[PDB]
Amino acid sequence: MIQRTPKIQVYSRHPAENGKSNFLNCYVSGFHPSDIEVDLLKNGERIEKVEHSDLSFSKDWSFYLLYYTEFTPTEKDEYACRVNHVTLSQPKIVKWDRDM
Amino acid sequence: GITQSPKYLFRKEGQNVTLSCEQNLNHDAMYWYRQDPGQGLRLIYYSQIVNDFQKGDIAEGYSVSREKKESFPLTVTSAQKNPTAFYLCASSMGGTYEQYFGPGTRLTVTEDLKNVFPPEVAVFEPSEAEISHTQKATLVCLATGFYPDHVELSWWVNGKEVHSGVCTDPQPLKEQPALNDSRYALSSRLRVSATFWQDPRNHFRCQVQFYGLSENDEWTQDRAKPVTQIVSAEAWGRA
Amino acid sequence: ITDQVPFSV
Amino acid sequence: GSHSMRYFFTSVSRPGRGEPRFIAVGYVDDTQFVRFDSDAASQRMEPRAPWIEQEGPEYWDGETRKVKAHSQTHRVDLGTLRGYYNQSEAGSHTVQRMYGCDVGSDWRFLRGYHQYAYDGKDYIALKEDLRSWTAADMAAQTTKHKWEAAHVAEQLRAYLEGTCVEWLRRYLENGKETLQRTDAPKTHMTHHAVSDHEATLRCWALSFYPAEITLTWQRDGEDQTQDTELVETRPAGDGTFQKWAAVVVPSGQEQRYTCHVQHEGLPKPLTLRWE
Amino acid sequence: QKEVEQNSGPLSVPEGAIASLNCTYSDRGSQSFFWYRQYSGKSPELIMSIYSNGDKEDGRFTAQLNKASQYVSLLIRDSQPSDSATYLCAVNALLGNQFYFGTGTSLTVIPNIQNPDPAVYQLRDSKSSDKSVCLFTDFDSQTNVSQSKDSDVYITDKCVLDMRSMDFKSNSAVAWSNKSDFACANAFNNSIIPEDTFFPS
């Protein structure tokens, strides 16, 4: 069984501007099997209003998914998504960088 | 492959009947069609998978069940206004794949069993004029007065069924076309050489298999019971 | 539109 | 080619926890327009793009029945494959199917494909001529002989060369304002001081469609791939895509580096500078 | 209209010649096209299947498909008496996951029986010399038999027999009545009878 660890990317749909609403994206790709746990975090706590796309895979059969939610960026709130997979010894957390 | 029983059915209106259909082709899709004389196929019911079924175009008065993958029993309820039809069952790998039909079932439903009659078979010896003009001899067989039209005619020469020189009408002929419950007639020809008919040691027999009431069906009329039977007529050679 | 029901391996 | 329609099917067995999970999605180019999820509530093929919502009930009822039977076929495959490899029923396995067609500039057939995977590895695929099979291992060769004796390739070719191309044309016409669009990349550049002697320049490309894009760096007009970072294209969430590329530059000479963006909506590549 | 259409009118073709059956359909994601044969009182039998444009040959059969014009046809080489049946056109439909049948076209091949010697004979019953039937036989295939307008007189359609001892084939039609005043001369007056038909005394 081919097992691959997911590649994580945290980013916003539009250029982040404090005060105006945006979308927070956690793009997981290049993983197998498909069973994966993705949670978007705000200051460490899980956001419960989080949607995700429909499961699809690439030419190499690896799966990819997009998790997203509506949020309003501030200058002091830290955002991240936590990803759990069978190939991860512990859940991996990737902080959101506005410059990335 | 796929089978359906019985080949001929005959019931009285007012009660439900069950037409069986079974296939061991591991097919998920199964279909029920009916067909009228001179007409096409018309979908009644079909099933994509077990425990499911969908109404066709003339589902009114019919009902089906799919409890198992191989069986698809069709029920003709008293609500169906014209149950008399040729019923065909088919199965396929899926909704868009070619279907394979079963042998078919001829269902005939009548008001009273008082119009069920076996055939009257007669054979007519060749004319002397035909023998001297074309040097050939044509025997004619007539099955008359039977109902329904569930008959199979065959010629037997010296105890062996023949097919060369035989011609039979494609379908029976209504004796009284204006009647809904008319009795039917059927003709057939057997043409042999003149020297073959002129041998008195040759035996000709016209056998007509009739499908009617079963031995288990009830019968309350003084007339002879029109059970499924064989009626034939014989003839020898003449010089 | 999708193709017809596939064959099993 | 110019356009394409692709379908993706995945079944994941759940031993001792229920029937396998079945997910199917359809895509025209980079736009998803249909979905099915066995765990979702609707239990039907659902629309995911506006232009497909105009299809009548015969379409949605038919597609729902077809993907459901497709999931049933995968239920049989998941068990059959265990016997091919002599595997136990205590582990979870996945099967994946994928097919579709590509069309040229005249919207006529160009290319077809139909491939099958087991546990994330190639299992069996239709070759480019749509007339032969590529078997991975011993177990696939048993499937190949069966599908050859059933004349499967002849019937798959009729879809990929026929129905697939014809209904791709139909979708492209019904969704002209969405599918036949092309959004040029919105580009800009950022600067990040790494230390006193080095700085990072990040070249941005946003809100572009379709997803195919290329970002290259140049120094004094010559290509430079050293000390360059290129992130993978990601979806924006509103039907567009994002990508950026970075390079480390000695402080003071950032004016000698240029970013080049190549995309379908740019007849000539865009050039990006910092000053 | 309907999804699958074919002229159900009886098509007659001379034996040994080419028999072509046409079929047109409304595209419903139509990808597979089939031909079924059905004899009288029998179930439909799959005989032909085509999936790509062009001609598909199988023995004396040839299936032709032109998806552009929505046209499926079937060509029968060397028309034989066994080919007389009803041929059903079938077209699948990926839109809706359906499988549609046409109403079917009845085909009958006529035998090119040279040396026609038409005549109307009278045959008496074997067990009782009272009953009798008239036999119109040995006429060319261009002759048609019309049913009687008298409810007391029954007339059958023409029907071909094939003798194998000699290479001989012939048409025949039977008529009879219980009036006992009905003769073989006025039996087939409803039908167009050739001018040189022999009538015995």
CB of D65 within 8 Å of a chain E CB? The answer is yes
Nearest by CB to E95, from C1, C3, C5: name it.
Answer: C1
Nearest CA to D9 among D52, D58, D61, D72?
A: D72
Range of the domain at B225: 112-239
Q: Which two tokens stand for residue D82?
A: 């265990």
- Which chains have 3 or more CB–CB distances shorter than 8 Å to chain D? A, B, C, E
Q: Are residues D44 and D58 in the same domain?
A: yes
The token duo for B73 is 């029993």
Q: Is the CB of residue D163 less than 8 Å away from at least one CB of chain E?
A: yes
Sheet strands side by side (includes B229-236): B160-162, B151-157, B203-210, B229-236
CA–CA distances in Å: residue C8 to residues A13, A19, B235, D143, D158? 42, 55, 61, 8, 19
- Give the domain-ending residue among B79, B111, B143: B111
What values do phi and psi take at C2, rounded to 5?
A: -80, 160
Q: Among residues E125, E155, E188, which one has the least CA distance to residue B174?
A: E155
Put simply, whether C5 touches B (Cβ < 8 Å) is yes
Boundary of a domain, candidates D164, D181, D198: D181
C-alpha–C-alpha distance, residues B212 and B198, integer Å: 37
Which H helix or E strand runs over D140? helix D138-149
Quote the CA–CA distance of D212 and D199 in Å, as a whole number.
28
3-state secondary structure of D241: strand
DSSP state of D53: G
In the numeric block, which tokens belong to residue A67? 């998790």
- Stated as kind and residue range, the H or E segment containing E46 is strand E45-50
Residues B118 and B101 in one domain: no
Cα(B180)–Cα(B235) distance, integer angstroms: 35
Q: Decide: B and A in contact? Rule: 3+ Cβ pairs under 8 Å.
A: no
User: By CA distance, what is D160's nearest residue in E?
Assistant: E31
Pair E76, E56: CB distance under 8 Å: no
3-state secondary structure of D151: coil
Q: What is the DSSP letter of E68?
A: G
Separation between Cα atoms, residue A65 and residue D235, nearest integer Å: 10
* E83 closest CA partner among E141, E17, E140, E164: E17
DSSP 8-state class, residue B72:
-
Residue D103 near residue D92 (C-beta atoms within 8 A):
no
Residues D69, D170 within the same domain: yes
Alpha-carbon distance of C5 to D24, in angstroms, equals: 13
Q: Specify the 3-state DSSP secondary structure of D72.
A: helix
Point out the domain boundary residue: B78, B111, B144.
B111
Which of D5, D45, D55, D58 to substitute to test the interface with E, most E CBs within 10 Å?
Answer: D58
Q: Say whether A9 and D232 touch across the interface (CB within 8 A).
A: yes
The A residues from 35 to 94 touching D (CB cutoff 8 Å) are 35, 53-57, 61-63, 66, 68
Contacts of C4 in chain E (CB under 8 A): 31, 92, 94, 97
B91 and B132 assigned to the same domain? no
Q: How many CB atoms lie within 10 A of CB E177?
A: 19
Dist. CA B4–CA E106, nearest whole Å: 25
Residue D99 sits at the chain E interface (C-beta within 8 Å): no
Q: Is E92–C4 a contact, with Cβ atoms under 8 angstroms apart?
A: yes
The distance from CA D249 to its chain's CA centroid, rounded to whole angstroms, is 35
**What is the rounded distance in angstroms from the CA atom of residue E28 to the CA atom of residue B106?**
33
Element housing B233 (H / E): strand B229-236
D24: buried, middle or exposed (CB in 10 Å: 19+, 13-18, 0-12)? buried
Task: For chain B, say whether C1 makes contact (Cβ under 8 Å).
Answer: no
Pairwise CA distance, residues B135 & A78, whole Å? 111
Best mutation target, E110, E121, E131, E199, to test chain B (most B CBs within 10 A): E121
Residue B95 DSSP SS3: coil
Using a CB-CB cut-off of 8 Å, the residues of chain B touching D68 are 49
Closest to C5 (Cβ–Cβ): which among D7, D73, D116? D73
Question: How far apart are the two ends of chain D, measured CA to CA in Å?
Answer: 38
Query: Before B6, cis peptide (omega within 30)?
Result: yes
Please give the tally of structural domains in chain B: 2
* B86 shares its domain with B22: yes
Cα D255 to the center of its chain, rounded Å: 38
Q: How far apart are CA A98 and CA A77, in angstroms?
A: 12
User: Is residue D47 in some structural domain?
Assistant: yes
- E52: tokens are 């790509």
Domain around D201: 182-270
Rounded CA gap, D9 and D182, in Å? 28
Please check whether residue D167 lies inside any domain of the structure.
yes
Chains E, B in contact, 3 or more Cβ pairs below 8 Å:
yes
Q: What is d(CA D159, CA E94) in angstroms, rounded to the nearest whole number?
A: 10
Please give the structure tokens belonging to residue B5: 């029983």
Same domain? For D64 and D107 the reply is yes
- Hey, what are A6's tokens? 């997911």
Q: Which of D61, D72, D157, D163 to mutate to test the interface with E (most CBs of E within 10 A)?
A: D163
User: Other CB atoms closer than 10 Å to residue B40's CB: what's the count?
Assistant: 17
* Cα–Cα distance for residue pair E29/E12, rounded to 1 Å: 33
Instruction: Please name the member of D27, D121, D236 whose beta carbon is closest to the beta carbon of A13.
Output: D236
C9 touches chain E (CB under 8 A): no
Tokens representing E5 are 């259409």
Chain B residues within 8 A of C4 when measuring between CB atoms: 94-97
Neighbours, chain A (3 or more CB pairs < 8 A): D
Please check whether residue D61 touches E, CB under 8 A.
yes
Helix (H) or strand (E) holding B109: strand B105-110
Residue B182: other Cβ atoms inside 10 A: 15
Q: Which residues of E3-22 are buried (b: 16+ CB within 10 A; e: fewer)?
A: bbbbeeeebebebeeebebe
Neighbour-count burial of A84, counting CB atoms closer than 10 A to its CB (0-12 exposed, 13-18 middle, 19+ buried) = middle
Q: At A10, give phi and psi (nearest 5°).
A: -110, 130
Which residues, in sequence order, are CB contacts of B137 under 8 Å at separation 6+? B126, B130, B131, B191, B192, B193, B194, B196, B197, B198
List the determination method: X-ray
**How many helices, marked H, and strands, marked E, lie in chain B?**
2, 21
First to last CA, chain C: 23
Q: Which residue of B has its CA nearest to C2?
A: B96
Taking phi first (over 0 means left), then psi (-120 to 50 degrees means alpha), and beta for anything else, what does residue B118 get? beta
The verdict on E95 touching D (C-beta cutoff 8 Å) is: yes
CA D203 to chain centre: 25
Going by their DSSP bridges, the two strands B41-47 and B29-35 should be labelled as: antiparallel
Asked if residue D146 and residue D118 are part of one domain, the reply reads: yes
D31 lies in some domain: yes
Q: What is the 3 state secondary structure string of E84-112? A: CEEEEEEEEECCCCEEEECCCEEEEEECC
- The subunits that touch chain E, with at least 3 C-beta pairs less than 8 Å apart, are B, C, D
Q: How far apart are CA D162 and CA D166, in angstroms?
A: 6
> Do B10 and B56 fall within a single domain?
yes
Mark whether B45 and B122 lie in a shared domain: no
Distance from CA of C7 to the nearest CA of D (A): 7
Q: Cβ neighbours of residue A28 under 8 Å, at least 6 residues apart? A: A6, A7, A8, A36, A38, A64, A65, A66, A67, A83
Residues D63 and D27 grouped into a single domain: yes
Buried b (16+ CB within 10 A) or exposed e, E62-94: bbbbebeeeebbbebeebeeebbbbbbbbbbbb
Neighbours of D206 (CB within 10 A): 18
Is residue D275 included in any domain, yes or no? Answer: no
CA D245 to chain centre: 22
Domain check: are B3 and B27 in the same one? yes
Q: Are D164 and D176 in contact (CB under 8 A)?
A: no
- Give the gap in angstroms from C-alpha B57 to the nearest C-alpha of chain C: 23
Same domain, D11 and D61: yes
Residue B115 DSSP label: G
Please provide the size of chain A in residues.
100
Those residues whose C-beta lies under 8 Å from the C-beta of residue A27, and which sit 6 or more positions away, are A8, A9, A10, A11, A64, A65, A66, A67, D234, D235
What's at B17, amino acid-wise?
A: V
Chain E nearest CA to D30, separation (Å)? 23
Measuring CA to CA, which residue among D223, D275, D214 is closest to residue D247? D223
Are B136 and E117 in contact by the 8 Å Cβ rule? The answer is no
Q: Where are the beta strands (DSSP E) in chain D?
A: 3-14, 18-28, 31-37, 46-47, 94-103, 109-118, 121-126, 133-135, 186-193, 198-208, 213-219, 222-223, 228-230, 234-235, 241-250, 257-263, 270-272
In the listed set D181, D208, D240, which residue is the last one of a domain according to the structure?
A: D181
**10 Å Cβ neighbour count for E105?**
20
- What is the spatial distance between Cα B220 and Cα B229, in angstroms, rounded to a whole number? 19
Beta-carbon contacts of E24 under 8 Å, excluding residues fewer than 6 positions away, are: E4, E5, E6, E70, E71, E72
Distance from CA of B72 to the nearest CA of C (A): 21
Element (H, E) at D164: helix D164-174
With contact defined as 3+ CB pairs under 8 Å, the chains touching C are: B, D, E
Chain B contact for E131 (CB, 8 A cutoff): yes
Q: Which of D147, D166, D181 is the last residue of a domain?
A: D181
Residues of E whose CB is below 8 A from B94 = 97
CA distance B151 to B188: 12
Beta-sheet strands, E only, within chain A = 7-12, 22-31, 37-42, 45-46, 51-52, 56-57, 63-71, 79-84, 92-95
B94 plus B130 within the same structural domain = no
Residues D240 and D256 in one domain: yes
D interface test, pick of A29, A32, A57 with most D CB neighbours within 10 Å: A57
Q: Tokens 């261009």 correspond to what residue?
A: E142
Element (H, E) at D145: helix D138-149
B97 touches C at CB < 8 Å? yes
- Domain total for chain D? 2
List CB contacts (< 8 A) between C2 and chain E.
94
**Residue A31 in contact with partner chain D when CB distance is under 8 A:** no
For residues B118 and B209, membership in a common domain is answered with: yes
Residues B227 and B129 in one domain: yes
Q: List all chains that touch chain B, counting a touch as 3 or more CB pairs closer than 8 Å.
A: C, D, E
Q: How far apart are CA B137 and CA B44, in angstroms?
A: 49
Q: List the resolution, Å.
A: 2.8
Q: Is E95 in Cβ contact with C3 (below 8 Å)? A: no
Q: Are B10 and B213 in contact (CB under 8 A)?
A: yes
From the number of C-beta atoms within 10 Å of its C-beta (0-12, 13-18, 19+), residue B65 rates as middle
Do B138 and B227 share a domain, yes or no?
A: yes
Q: Is residue B91 located within the same domain as residue B151?
A: no
Task: Please indicate, yes or no, whether residues D87 and D173 belong to a single structural domain of this protein.
Answer: yes
In this structure, the answer to whether residues D21 and D156 fall within a common structural domain is yes
Give the torsion through C-alpha atoms of B90, B96, B98, B101, to 10 deg.
Answer: 10
Residues B98 and B136 in one domain: no
Q: Which residues in chain E have Cβ-Cβ distances shorter than 8 Å to C1?
A: 29, 94-95
Kindly list the distances between the CA atom of residue E143 and the CA atoms of E116, E158, E185, in Å, as whole numbers in the listed order. 11, 9, 17
